[PDB]
Structure formats: C-alpha cells, structure tokens
Paper text:
Cyanophycin, a nonribosomally synthesized polypeptide consisting of equimolar amounts of aspartate and arginine as the backbone and branched sidechain, respectively, was first identified in cyanobacteria in the form of opaque and light-scattering cytoplasmic granules. The biosynthesis of cyanophycin is achieved by a single enzyme named [name] (CphA1) that catalyzes peptide elongation coupled with ATP hydrolysis. The discrete active sites of the G and M domains are used for extending the Asp backbone and attaching the Arg sidechain, respectively.
The cryo-EM data of the substrate-bound state were collected under a high concentration of l-aspartate (100 mM), cyanophycin primer peptide, (β-Asp-Arg)4, and ATPγS. The [name] structure in the substrate-bound state visualizes the initial state of the catalytic reaction for the ATP-dependent addition of aspartate to the C-terminal backbone carboxy group of cyanophycin. While (β-Asp-Arg)4 was observed in all protomers, the substrate aspartate was observed only in one protomer (chain D). The substrate aspartate was visualized in the most stable Gω. The substrate aspartate was accommodated in a small space beside Ser396. Asn394, a residue on the large loop of Gω (residues 389‒399), and Arg323 interacted with the β-carboxy group of the substrate aspartate at distances of 2.5 Å and 3.4 Å, respectively. The α-carboxy group of the substrate aspartate was close to the sidechain of Arg458 (2.5 Å) in the [name] structure. In the substrate-bound state, His267 on the P-loopG is located between γ-phosphate and the C-terminal backbone carboxy group of (β-Asp-Arg)4. Cyanophycin and aspartate binding further changes Glid to a closed conformation, and the orientation of Gω is fixed to localize aspartate in a suitable position for the reaction by the interaction of Asn394 on the large loop with the substrate.
Author numbering:
A (entry chain D): 1 to 724
B (entry chain K), F (entry chain J): 1 to 3, 5
C (entry chain B): 115 to 228
D (entry chain B): 456 to 569
E (entry chain A): 570 to 683
Write the structure that this text describes.
C-alpha cells in the first residue's frame, strides 16, 4: 500500500464529462497485487462489519448488495478500495455516486477514480480508504474509534469548506441558470460569469453595492436623519450619552412609553423595548450602556405594532415577513411546562447555521422575561391564546416568521422602495414596526426602525407559515437582467502539433474586430497587446487568469494534453472547440499508452462544446474525424485535400467547412464557396510552401467564421499576421 | 455582522 | 453677505454689540475684538469641507452642476432627482463595498493581484 | 487624496477634480431635472396640480409640492403647508423624481429665498 | 393561417357538435384541435388543460415546452409536471396562482377578478 | 482614515 500520485480534477476530464469533481490516485499493490477478496481470510466479514453501509452499493449486477456479491466471488482490492472510499465520504453527508478503477501499463500500479463533493474531503477519504483496507487485510478488522475519528474529520472538512446559506442559494440559482461561478481566494467572494460580463458577490452584497449606502445603513442616527429629511415616518427620538441626559431626552420624545437601545449594537444586543417608569428607564440605560461598545445609547418613542422585515432587491419589494417572538398557545389545555419541550421535539427544530427555526432556548433572561409576562411555568394559557416568551422576535432564538408579501399595501411597497433607493442599497432589509402591513404607514402609526445592508434571507425562503419566496432568483435577475449568462466566447484549441500557432492566429484575427482578446499559449499569457504572464501557461491555472480578467471579451485558450490529464478543463463549456490532429509522438506519459487513449483524451475539448457551439475537426485525420459523434452542437470540418468525401458529404447537407482548393483558403457554406486569400499572400504559409501552416490557417479561419466574424476582418488578420 |  | 451661515450670524450679532460699546464708552476692548475674531475663525474652520471635497465642489460649480450638503455623514449631493450623484470625500455613490474592503486587506489584495 | 497631484511643486498640476466630475457626469450633462416654479397671488396650487397631471400623462415621475402637501408620483410624501425651500429640497433630492413642479409662495422667498 | 405559433392554448375538447364535416367521434375532434398544440414552435409553449384527459393526451407529439392549467390543485399529472420543471397554473385556495416548480406565485384572490 |  503506497500512494504514488494523488491528482484532483475540477473540470471535464479524460475519465468523465459532466463529472467535473474527481480525484485520481496511483495506488501500488506490491504484495496485494493479484489476490482476490476470497483469497484473503476473513476479509469479507471484517469489511462488512466495519462498513455495513456497503449493502446499498449497486455494482454492475445492479441489484441490492451487488458489490457484496462481487466481494464473495472475489475481485481485485482496487475495486473495494474505491467502494469504501465512496461510502466513507458518503457517510459524512456528501452523496457521491461515481467511481472507476483501471490497471495501468506498469506492473503493479493501479488507478482509482473517486467522485468527491469537497476537494479536501475527497482527498482525505481516498487516503483513509487504503489505510482501512490495509488494516482489514492485516488484522481482519478496523477499530471503531479510528472509524469515528475519520468520520468526524470528514464532517469537519465538509463544514470548513462550505459557503453560507445565502451564498449557497445564490450559487444554486446560478447553476440552475447556467451561469458559470468560481470562488475567489481573497474574502470568500464568488465570481459569476467571465471577462467583461462578470459579477461578484460576497454574502449578499454585490460588486455594485455602494460603500456610502452600506456605511449610511450602519449609522442609525444618520439613516434616521436622512429618512426624516425625505418625509419617511421614522421613530421620534434622540441620543443620550450620559446619565444626566435621561430625563431631558425623555421629555423630548413626548412622554411614555419609550425605548432604550445602544447605537453600536446589533441582533438585539442589550435592547429594552417597553419601559413605563423611571426605575425601568435607569435599569434599561445601565443595561444598554453595558451592551454598548462606546457607552452611547439612544432613546425614542415606543411604537405599538408587529415587527416586519421587508426585503428590497433592485428597488422592488421581494419578500415581506412578520417576525413573531417565541410563543406557545395552550389550545390543547396544556401549560407552558409541557409545550416548551413539545415544540423542541418538532423535527423543524435545528441549531447551527443551516436550520433557521431554532429551538426554544430557555435562558435565565428568558426566565426573567416570562416572569415579567404575568404568568408562570404551570399557568395554563387562557382560552388557548398566544403567550410570549420574549420580545426580540429573532429567528436565531426561537421565533417564527409569517409571509406577508401578498398582503402589503401598494403605498407601503412604493415607500419601502423609495427608502431603499434613498439609502442607496441594491439589496436592503428594512425593519418595519406597524399594526397592519395591509394599510399605509400613515393611517396606522407605522415606522421604519432601521435599514440593514447585506441582509440574510433564510427567513424568506422558508417562512414556515406561508409561501416561500425566490429571493435568490430576484438577486440573480438583478445581477443578470435578461436571459443573459455571464459567459464570453471561449475558443479552446487542442491538437498534437499546431496549438500555439493556431491560437496566436486566432487571437490576431479576432483583434481585427474591436475586441480585447485574452489568449494563453506556450510562450505566455497575453491580454490584448501586452503580456500578462510568462512561462508555459497552458493548463487551467492560466485559463482562470484570462477568464477572471475584467477587460477580456474573447478567450482563446491553448489546451494541451498535460493540463487535461492533470486537472481537466478550466471551463464547463466552450463556444468553439478545435481539434487539429492526433499523432502518437509523446506516448507513454501518464496512463496514455495507445493512440486511441490519446484520441479519447483530446476528444474532451470536442465533447465539451456547448449545444450552440461548433467543433472544428480535421477531416483528414481519421481519429479526429471519428469524434464527429458524441459531440453536442454543430461540426465544422477543415481539410487540406478538397476532395475529402466526408467533408463533401457534410457540405452537401448543411455546410460550414474550409478547404484549400486551388491555391485558395476557402470557406464552404454548403453550396457556396467563399474564398479568403490566395495562400501565397499569407506570410505564415511561406508563399504556400508550408502545408502545416496552411492547415492551421484553415482551422483558424473556419473557427472565426463559425462565430460570425466578417470576411474582410478574417482576410486582414490572415494577411497581417507574421510568423514569430 | 454579515447575514443581517 | 456671508460665506458661512453661523459665521455670518455671529458677525451680525457682534456688530451691534461693538457699535453699542463704542457709543457707550468711546471704544471697544481689544481683548473682546480678538475673542470675536478667534470665534469667527473657529466657525469658519468648523463649517469647512476638506480640500478634496472643496476641489470637487469647485469643479462642479464651474460646470454649473448643482450641489447640496447632506446632513448625515458629510456627503455632498450633485444634481437633482434621478440624475443625482453622491460623494463623501473621494468615494462616489458608485464605489463598491467589495472593492474598498478588498483594498483595505493587504494580504487579500496581494493574493488577488498575484 | 489627490492633494499632491493638484500641487506637485516639481511639475505640472493635474486636474483631478475634472476627471472625477467627468466620471460622475460623462458628457456635457449637468445633474439637473426640469424645474417648473409656479408663483403668483391667487392660483399657485391649482396651476401646480394641473401641471403635475399634464406631465403625469407623459410617462414621467413628477414630484410636486403644493399648499396641501408634497407629492411624489401618485402618493403623498409629506403633509403640511410645504411651499418653501425646505420642501423643495425633498423633491429635488428624491432619487425617483424626473420633473419637479414647485409652488413658490412669497413667504418662502421672504424667509429664506429660493 | 400560420406555420407556427409562439403559444398554443387548448382549453377543452367536448363532443357536442359532432357530425359536421368528417368529424364524427370525439377522438377525431381531439385530433383536429391538436393541430394548434402541434404547431407550437420548439421555443414556444403549449398551454393544455391537465383536467381534460383528451387535452392532456396531447402532451406528447408536441414540439416545445408544455404548460398545464387545472382548476383542481391536486391534479397528479400537474404536480408531477411541476416537480420536474414547472410552468403550471392552479386555483389553490381562492387564488389564481402560477407554479414555477417549487415556487408559488399568487396573482389574485379570484374574487377581485370581475 | 479618509483621504489616503
Ligand atoms: N422605537 C421603537 N419602537 C418600537 N419597537 C422598536 C423600536 N426600536 C426597536 N424596536 C423593536 O426592537 C427590534 C430591534 O431593534 P433594533 O434597533 O433593530 O435593535 P438591533 O440591535 O438592531 O437588533 P437587530 O439586528 O435590528 S434584530 C425591532 O425589530 C423592533 O421590533
Ligand atoms: N498542423 C501541423 N501539423 C503538423 N506539424 C505541425 C503543424 N503545425 C505546426 N507543426 C510543427 O510543429 C511545430 C511546433 O508547433 P507549435 O504550434 O509552435 O507548438 P505546439 O503545437 O503548441 O506544441 P506544444 O505541445 O505546445 S510545445 C512547428 O514548428 C511545426 O514544425
Ligand atoms: N388666476 C386666478 N385669479 C384669481 N383668483 C384665482 C385664480 N386662480 C384661482 N383663484 C382663486 O383663488 C383661490 C385660492 O387659490 P389657490 O389656487 O386655491 O391656492 P393659492 O393660489 O396657492 O393660494 P395660497 O397662496 O396657497 S393661500 C382659489 O380657490 C380660486 O377661487
Ligand atoms: N451570513 C453569511 C455568512 C457566510 C460567510 N461567512 C463565513 N464565515 N464563511 C451567510 O452567507 O450566511
Ligand atoms: N448587517 C450588517 C451590515 C454589515 C455590512 N457588511 C460588511 N461586510 N461590511 C450589520 O452590521 O448590521
Ligand atoms: N480626506 C477628506 C476628509 C477631510 C474632512 N473630513 C471630514 N469628515 N469632514 C477630505 O475632504 O480631504
Ligand atoms: N484611505 C482610506 C481608505 C478607507 C476607506 N474609507 C472608508 N470610509 N471606509 C484609509 O482610511 O486609509
Ligand atoms: N438571518 C437570521 C435572521 C435575523 O437576522 O434575524 C437567521 O439566521 O435567523
Ligand atoms: Mg441591525
Ligand atoms: Mg433588525
Ligand atoms: Mg506550444
Ligand atoms: Mg395654495
């Protein structure tokens, strides 16, 4: 048991397409090479007692326990290591259902491919599976303490490399809409789209959310002043830094009752809602000052009514939810003492940062609040009426939310949209205290308590007493207004012998149109006319540089076999996929030992073409032409021999081919011939003395033509491109 | 802050 | 005419006191004069924008773009209605929170640029 | 801060404020919206409301202030007299108003001008 | 009168006026009314009554997406269609609602519709 | 803070 190499794949790869997340390990079986499970004494019993959850594995038999049946029959240990890795990382809450095992050319090493949900978790599961199997073959069993330790480590790895619920929802909406998304390495930022069409979100703030609006929302007094200057009904109040200003600030608001709360607090840190006498006032001031980070508190008039949270996205009201504090209703002739734990037994109860409906936490502060309530633990509710436990009305403590989006008055919608625009927030969460949200805030004495930037919408997507609202859909509509993804044209060039020249020629041709082209070749990574990075720069690690640049409009990426083998493609799909040729020259590197394997590996580019894209294939190469099937999207053929029967048959029904007919680089659009240049005025062809250069020019011209590039632009780019 |  | 509202009101209030003292005693004490001058200078300094905001406001006035002072966080509003823009000192209303926060982070900025 | 750019002391000064205002207002465009000021002795409110209705027929958001109150679009933004500059600022600073029709009573002009 | 339609709506097929032309059976009438459903372009939509078995039978042999409407919110075919995809409409609890998969979008109370 |  020795792990030679451990590679992780992130895009389309040689092993699978549409299974981007895979881990491949080169596993040595020095002494355990050619013995089956039946040849190992007691292996099956130990394996099935350590991991009884192997019974659900549907192997090639396709029936319940088929993998087990294969184990009694006796197979190679690589298969069982694959299966135990899959089940080990599945038991940690990460469902994975893909796996492969293949014998390599070398005498002992195998290749095990395991699907993963988390990169670190997948690698850890792969590393742990071999240890588990070695321990079983050595001692007949695996310790349960080590299994629990590994499962806990896997769960910790899954939790650590996880986004937030808001980020998860937005990312899932992006995937549903086909918008590419990647994770930036700075501040948990997510980039949607490519190039000039890209957007960024952190949690709910986008790259278009203003600094001024966010900073004004965080300023309670500044927000109140601005809203009052706009005629918005904000609560009447003032700030009080010291003890002596309590009375004077009290008479300002207009009598009793009043509210005491610090301005440097959030999530109800030390806020006292209702006070009706001086002793309560001074106690509230002391408590808020203790909770205040700057010893500063604000006083204001107390407004009766329910607490509502209104979510405004792109200036439109998306969701309205009323926050009811933790309460129990005794309509079943039962008191609080039973209901406190009766509610706690609801499966909807959940702690952490995933289940929004938190269990009813009975703290000593809660005991004090229920003492103020006027009833006790065994005091049965009267008539079966709601009896509260606190007054903060927060989902983090055990409150509930009620959807009121369909009941909000149109005047309230207009007012809240105006408030969000005045503050300057594209996504805002407005807290409203009002007796009835179905009536305008002027008739009832409703107020705007505060405006929150970067709000959490977990309470709107799962109200628990109403209809869920597609908040992530509204956010993504704001980010990408129409039916537009964030994609830019991507042209991936692959092949054995002409990748760099074709890439440079494509970039030069596209530069003729007024577009910024970011292309990576063997020489280096270029953005426009300037060199972005030196070195090889051929794998996806350089494709990300092009795709993340805010100025790149078209991406032309040279995709060598090494990058695809190491970590797969750097993109889910490409607008144009070019396969130039497949020749067995550097054979034996990696697991590629036959030219059929090389063709399969190079076919990843062709098979990753989107259904609306094109695959530019060489009709003269039988292996490349054989990739005509299993390709989504149209196929375009280029051939240095104009009498290619496959190309002619393809042009007869359809078209989009390129040939070299009579000293001419020509595009065939079916029954029409469009000549580009005499191929002796093309400098790279060396007056037509270099057939390889002519083939590269054919491929590049066909690729740009398939994208609608105008003919004279192609001609100018082909004539002005110099070999260098 | 975050997720207000 | 005034340049600062508080300074102008203070000058108007002090002028009548100075004239009354002159008519009553024939002169005004130099200590009171220097106290009033220092108070006026303090009022001028207090209600003054920064050189960045001053320069931007001067350019806006030169271009005939209306400007007003918001009462929250020393924000200046340019224009009216749907055509309005806001600046604080150099940040505009279109400056992103994410960009500013990333710039403030030295290691995050280095990682992103690398 | 662009202080060292507008007064280098060892080279040519650069118009940074001009660049900032070009960013804020790209073309030769000010931030103004059409302002219609109605004054007179006996018909300010009716004329203001009729003008607001006529402009509302065009697909524009009209913010107008009259003696009855301040209106933005079809909804009342503020109650009271609202015929002075203190109510004109509410209309002129609203991010949704495209046309401003202001009833300018003589009291506001006498008190604090336009 | 057209080669294709963006939306093709089939409300119901009831055998009432049979015998006209060559149409003598309700199957023939359904086949005749299915011309509209089958003329929908691949990017178009076919709005079919899930509550009508004959109209719902036109779900196949139709190019483009299919949308179901039903006065009964518990229609098994409609619910199965919404679970995998969406774009349906129901009358659930005194509401005219649009089902976009797992999302419910209410339009009106159906008592405010004259 | 401010003007950097
Ligand atoms: N003046 C007021 N009158 C009536 N209720 C108020 C008043 N101020 C606050 N509240 C209530 O107290 C709740 C919390 O007030 P906040 O000022 O938002 O305190 P907080 O520190 O911001 O806590 P969060 O983060 O907003 S939940 C509001 O949601 C209202 O329900
Ligand atoms: N279409 C072609 N068919 C065969 N040989 C070619 C072709 N195009 C170029 N060559 C030859 O291959 C050499 C290298 O090709 P390049 O395109 O410059 O590099 P490359 O294809 O990127 O190879 P790598 O793997 O990136 S180093 C050229 O100098 C030619 O001699
Ligand atoms: N052009 C006019 N000439 C004379 N009287 C007029 C005219 N237009 C209206 N009035 C009358 O003047 C009354 C008061 O004027 P309004 O237009 O209603 O309000 P107003 O002009 O703003 O008065 P103030 O300044 O707000 S108290 C109206 O009710 C009419 O009867
Ligand atoms: N509120 C926000 C938090 C997720 C990002 N924070 C951390 N520590 N990863 C969310 O998306 O819920
Ligand atoms: N809700 C939150 C707003 C803080 C803004 N977020 C960041 N990252 N600056 C609050 O503190 O109220
Ligand atoms: N840097 C900026 C701030 C100067 C004045 N500051 C405040 N808060 N008024 C500037 O304008 O130069
Ligand atoms: N230069 C300045 C950057 C801080 C960004 N400004 C605000 N208001 N967050 C600094 O303080 O160094
Ligand atoms: N997003 C919060 C709700 C709140 O801010 O009150 C939660 O997780 O419950
Ligand atoms: Mg808050
Ligand atoms: Mg709040
Ligand atoms: Mg190369
Ligand atoms: Mg009037």
């Amino acid at each position: 048991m020795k792990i030679l190499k451990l590679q992780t794949l992130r895009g389309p790869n040689y092993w699978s397409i549409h299974r981007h997340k895979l881990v491949v390990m080169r596993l040595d079986l020095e002494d355990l090479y050619e013995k089956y499970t039946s040849d190992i004494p007691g292996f099956y019993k130990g394996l099935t007692e350590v991991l009884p959850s192997l019974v659900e594995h549907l192997c090639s038999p396709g029936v319940k326990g088929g993998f087990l049946t294969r184990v009694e029959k006796g197979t190679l240990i690589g298969h069982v290591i694959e299966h135990v890795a899959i089940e080990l990382q599945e038991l940690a809450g990460m469902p994975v259902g893909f796996g492969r095992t293949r014998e390599t050319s070398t005498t002992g090493v195998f290749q095990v491919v395991i699907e993963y949900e988390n990169e670190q978790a997948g690698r850890y599961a792969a590393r742990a599976a071999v240890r588990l199997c070695q321990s079983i073959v050595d001692t007949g069993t695996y310790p349960a303490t080590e299994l629990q330790q590994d499962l806990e480590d896997l769960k910790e790895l899954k939790n650590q490399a996880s986004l937030g619920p808001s980020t998860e929802a937005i990312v899932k909406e992006a995937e549903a809409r086909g918008i590419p998304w990647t994770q930036l390495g700075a501040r948990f930022m997510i980039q949607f789209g490519y190039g000039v069409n890209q957007k960024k979100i952190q949690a709910t703030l986008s790259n278009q959310t203003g600094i001024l609006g966010v900073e004004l929302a965080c300023d309670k007094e500044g927000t109140k002043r601005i809203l009052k200057d706009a005629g918005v009904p904000v609560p009447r109040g003032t700030v009080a830094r010291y003890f002596d200003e309590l009375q004077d600030a009290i008479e300002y608001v207009g009598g009793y009752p009043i509210v005491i709360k610090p301005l440097d607090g959030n999530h109800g840190r030390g806020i006292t809602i209702d006070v009706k006498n001086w002793q309560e006032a001074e106690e509230a001031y002391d408590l808020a000052r203790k909770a205040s980070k700057t010893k500063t508190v604000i006083v204001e008039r107390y407004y009766t009514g329910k607490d509502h949270r209104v979510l405004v996205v792109n200036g439109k009201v998306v969701a309205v939810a009323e926050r009811v504090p933790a309460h129990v209703v005794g309509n079943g002739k039962s008191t609080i003492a039973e209901l406190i734990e009766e509610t706690n037994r609801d499966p909807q109860r959940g702690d952490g940062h995933d289940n929004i409906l938190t269990r009813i936490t009975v703290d000593k502060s809660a005991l004090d609040i229920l003492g103020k309530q006027g009833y006790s633990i065994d005091s049965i509710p009267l008539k079966g009426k709601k009896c509260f436990l606190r007054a903060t009305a927060n989902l983090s403590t055990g409150g509930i939310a009620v959807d009121r989006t369909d009941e909000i008055h149109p005047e309230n919608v207009w007012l809240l949209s105006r408030v969000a625009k005045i503050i300057g927030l594209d996504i805002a969460g407005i807290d409203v205290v009002t007796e009835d949200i179905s009536q305008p805030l002027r008739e009832v004495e409703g107020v705007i308590v505060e405006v929150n930037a970067a709000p959490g919408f977990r309470m709107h997507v799962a109200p628990s007493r109403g209809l869920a609202r597609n908040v992530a859909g509204a956010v993504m509509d704001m980010l990408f207004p129409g039916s537009k993804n964030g994609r830019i044209p991507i042209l991936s060039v692959t092949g054995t012998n002409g990748k760099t020249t074709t890439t440079r020629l494509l970039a030069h041709i596209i530069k003729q149109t007024g577009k910024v082209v970011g292309y990576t070749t063997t020489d280096g990574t270029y953005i426009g006319e300037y060199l972005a990075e030196t070195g090889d720069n051929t794998g996806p690690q350089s494709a990300h540089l092009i795709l993340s640049d805010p100025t790149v409009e078209v991406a032309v990426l040279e995709t060598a076999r090494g990058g695809i083998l190491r970590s797969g493609l750097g993109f889910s799909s490409c607008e144009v996929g070019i396969v130039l040729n497949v020749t067995a020259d550097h054979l034996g590197i990696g697991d590629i030992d036959t030219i059929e394997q090389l063709a399969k590996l190079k076919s990843v580019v062709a098979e990753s073409v989107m259904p609306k894209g094109y695959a530019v294939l060489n009709a003269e190469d039988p292996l490349v032409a054989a990739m005509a099937d299993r390709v989504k999207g149209q196929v375009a053929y280029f051939s240095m021999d104009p009498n290619n029967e496959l190309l002619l048959r393809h042009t007869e029904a359809g078209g989009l081919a390129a040939i070299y007919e009579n000293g001419y680089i020509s595009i065939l659009k079916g029954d029409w011939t469009l000549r580009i240049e005499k191929a002796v005025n093309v400098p790279i062809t060396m007056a037509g003395k270099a057939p390889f250069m002519i083939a590269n020019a054919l491929a590049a011209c066909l690729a740009v033509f398939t994208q609608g590039v105008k003919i004279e632009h192609i001609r100018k780019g082909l004539s002005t491109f110099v070999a260098s | 802050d975050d997720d207000d």
